[PDB]
Design a protein around this ligand. Sequence first.
Ligand code: MB2
Ligand code: ZN
Length: 257
Amino acid sequence: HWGYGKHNGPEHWHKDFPIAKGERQSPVDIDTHTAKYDPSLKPLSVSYDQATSLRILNNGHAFNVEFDDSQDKAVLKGGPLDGTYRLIQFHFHWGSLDGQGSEHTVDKKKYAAELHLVHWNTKYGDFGKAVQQPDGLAVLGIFLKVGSAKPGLQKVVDVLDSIKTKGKSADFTNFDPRGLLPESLDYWTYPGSLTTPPLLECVTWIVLKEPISVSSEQVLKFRKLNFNGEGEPEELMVDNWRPAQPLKNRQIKASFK
Ligand SMILES: NS(=O)(=O)c1ccc(NC(=O)NS(=O)(=O)c2ccc(F)cc2)cn1
Ligand SMILES: [Zn+2]
């Protein structure tokens, strides 16, 4: 039932998913002047050299590039995290216009899109288990702005015509997620949630300060995807972002001065 339309959008989600009004919901606005530098935060460790991408799927709300997470092949460690978190998938949220699309905002600024690299804590054995734990997931969030093309994104962009509609998938092997990362790993971090239903409060959010640049042509191809299934009326997959939620009793920490 849920989606991003007028009658099933983020303002409606709480009826099926009451945790939508919970104490640690995501995304949030990152007020850069109120975030506090935490000198004890360790450097982030992104170890994606052995990543095994498998498939790309249009799930009716975004597209997921899925990875083999049956071994420690692509892992996130360090930063605020205790232990090892395995990459399971990445996806994006984006707008109908370049002035919106990101879920997190920075001093109320919206970016054109936001990349989420989703990882689960290996002490919980699998993803299903992990989402039931307050420290189950670590999502690495990366802002996208429109400017120069991101060469490492192009392989993703070019397969999207083959997964135009909900439920379509395509082989997507040998994709290197390192090509989607910015130069700096400076980040903000806070405890939060999944930003789509079931909105579970299981995520340590790590949001990078440096956005990546993608071209207008690249983002325009995102906007050609469909929310609908094949043979249903076309509704463009755009504005698949949840707006900022109340920070409540949380402090955002910065890894950098
Ligand atoms: N936007 S986000 O916070 O990175 C994010 C990542 C993942 C999800 N949801 C998700 O994976 N849902 S799911 O695949 O159907 C699923 C699978 C297993 C579960 F136990 C619970 C949910 C929602 N949001
Ligand atoms: Zn997401």
